[PDB]
Amino acid sequence: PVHLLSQTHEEGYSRLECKKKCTLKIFCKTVCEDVFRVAKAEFRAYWCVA
Amino acid sequence: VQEDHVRSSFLLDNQNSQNTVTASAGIAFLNIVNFKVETDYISQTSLTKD
Known about the structure:
Largest interface: A-B, 7 and 6 residues
Strand order of the largest sheet of chain A: 1-4
Protein name (chain A): Macrophage-expressed gene 1 protein, processed form
Organism (chain A): Mus musculus
Distance between the termini of chain A: 9 Å
Membrane topology (chain A): Multi-pass membrane protein
Shape of chain A: rod-shaped
Oligomer: part of a larger assembly
Subcellular location (chain A): Cytoplasmic vesicle, Phagosome membrane
Order of helices and strands of chain A: EEEE
Largest sheet of chain A: 2 strands, antiparallel
Helix content of chain A: under 10%
Number of strands of chain A: 4
Structural class of chain A: mainly beta
């Protein structure tokens, strides 16, 4: 599995966020607020050769 | 020989919560003839999902 090529990308998806938050431990609110995020992945190709 | 199926599905949600917290003061006849304190606080949360 010899390394074909490494590469990286940078894309952004407004993720999912449905979280509940307590005010003062008596009552809680669910503050759904989807947030921006630039995710990145490093694509490492590994050419397979006999 | 002919046939057909239809299968509708409709699921709706809602969580319409609310809060209202108020405080007050008014210690005023002696050593300070007047000073008044009151805070207000109202929070809402309405989340529908269909």
